[PDB]
Structures are given as structure tokens and as C-alpha cells.
Amino acid sequence: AFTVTVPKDLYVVEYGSNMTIECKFPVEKQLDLAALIVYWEMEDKNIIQFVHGEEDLKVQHSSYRQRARLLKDQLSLGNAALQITDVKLQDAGVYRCMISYGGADYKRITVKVNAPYA
Amino acid sequence: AFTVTVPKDLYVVEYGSNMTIECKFPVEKQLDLAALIVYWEMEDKNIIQFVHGEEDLKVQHSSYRQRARLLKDQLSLGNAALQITDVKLQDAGVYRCMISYGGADYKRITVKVNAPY
Ligand SMILES: CCNCc1nnnn1/C=C/c1cccc(-c2ccccc2)c1C
């Protein structure tokens, strides 16, 4: 169980930059993939669905296609790290990470996107 | 595998009646309390937190204090049944059941409240 903990509740980013938003969870030794579920969401649009190690491209929302990815490397450290490359204005909003790894919690994260200033 | 399934996505209810909204989940005739978590929420108000056998009373928001309860009887049958008694207009809105039982899924249910005159 415990609690999902978030380093930063707000990320302010540049248009066309990259960002990695993070949700930490209690890990403790190795990662038992059978126990792990990570869902990232915003505005009820599926960004990531990780289910015991399974991800399907097809479930992802098109706006996030080929840009958002979950850094599997950080998962073993108890860090659900969503990385979105080439941040779009439309990506501004509230993100929900939902994690289960022997008990479950969710946190909300806000994103503000600065204009490109053409 | 794990998918939360809802009989009714909308409930239209009477003011001052009771309602019971339900979220079904896969149980294999097993029903391991230690594994099960049920969170009911609406408009970011915690209604129920069933955690590992017990209802957590403390975290329930005081608007749903003596009114919302989880039907424990149904849980064994893979049915997270939130019952709220004496429905107020304020109880109209979108409910989110989050269930974790060896894997995890959520669904939204909308509630519309009638009062005839
Ligand atoms: C359909 C395939 N299954 C995966 C899936 N699909 N939609 N959502 N989802 C997973 C959701 C999830 C994942 C982890 C924890 C919690 C959760 C549980 C209780 C409290 C807080 C958070 C939830 C609700």
C-alpha cells in the first residue's frame, strides 16, 4: 500500500521541450513485475498502461503516440517516470498516475506549457 | 484479465431515496481480503476506502458520514456495492470506483437526482 509520492506537483515547461514527470512508490529489493501496475492519464486520455510488464500501443491516446513513454529503467527504483518528448500546448493539464504494487494510491500533477514565442 | 465492469453507467434517482451503485470485479471463488482494496470517490471526495478487510471510517468525508456504506456481503461475490442513504441533490455527479485485487482498474458512474413537485 503505503502512498504514491510526487517530487513536483507543478511542472512548467517550454513548447517543444521534453519533460519527465515522476511518481515514486515503495519498492524495496527487486521489482516483482507480477505485482506492478502503472496507469498514467490526463483529461481521461490513456497515456501509459503498464500491467505486470505489458504495454499495448493501441490503448494509448493518439495525441501521446510515439512521444510519451514510461521509463522502465526507473521502475526498478520505485519511480514511475512518464517522459513526454516534444511537449505540445495541448499537453497542459492535470495528470493522474495510478499505481498498484501490493496496495495502491494515486496522485495528481499539473503541467503548464509556455508558448514558443515565434 | 482484471477489468472493473459496471451494470449501470447512469443511475437516475429520487431525492431522499436510497441508491446502491455497483462495480463488479473478477473473483475466482477465492476472495482474499488481504489483497482487496476498494476506493469510492466523487468530485475528489473520499466516500469509501475498504482496505484489507476493514472499512476505513476516518478518511470518509463527513458529508457521507452516516449515509454511504459498502455492502460487505457483496464483496465476496466480486461486487463493490456503494450504498448511499437519503440521497441529496448534492449527491448528483460522477462516482469513481477504484478497485485493486491482484491488478487494478477503475470506472466512472454518473448519478442524476430527481425531485418532482
Ligand atoms: C483494463 C485493464 N486494467 C488496467 C486499467 N485500466 N484502467 N485503469 N486501470 C488501472 C487502474 C489503477 C491502477 C493502479 C492503482 C489504482 C488504484 C486503486 C485504488 C486506489 C487508488 C488507485 C487503479 C485504479
Numbering used by the authors:
A (entry chain B): 4 to 121
B (entry chain A): 4 to 120
The authors write:
As part of our continuing research towards small molecules that antagonize PD-1/PDL-1, we present here the synthesis, biological activity, and structural basis of 1,5-disubstituted tetrazoles as PD-1/PD-L1 antagonists. The electron density well explains the inhibitor structure and its interactions with the PD-L1 chains. Compound 10f interacts with PD-L1 through a series of hydrophobic interactions and hydrogen bonds in accordance with our modelling studies. The biphenyl moiety is stabilized between both PD-L1 subunits via hydrophobic interactions with APD-L1 Tyr56, Met115 and Tyr123 as well as BPD-L1 Ala121, Met115 and Ile54, all well-known from previously reported similar co-structures. The tetrazole moiety likely not only increases the solubility of compound 10f, but also provides additional interaction via hydrogen bonds with the APhe19 carbonyl backbone and ATyr123 nitrogen as well as BGln66 side chain amine further stabilizing the inhibitor and enhancing its affinity towards PD-L1. No aliphatic side chain but hydrogen at the α-position led to active compound 10f. To confirm the dimerization of the PD-L1 complex, molecules 10f, 10l and 10p were tested for the interaction with human PD-L1(hPD-L1) using a 1H NMR titration experiment and showed protein oligomerization upon addition of the ligand at the molar ratio of protein to inhibitor equal to 1 : 1, which is indicated as broadening of the hPD-L1 proton signals in the spectra. The corresponding behaviour is characteristic of hPD-L1 oligomerization, previously observed by our group with BMS reference compounds.
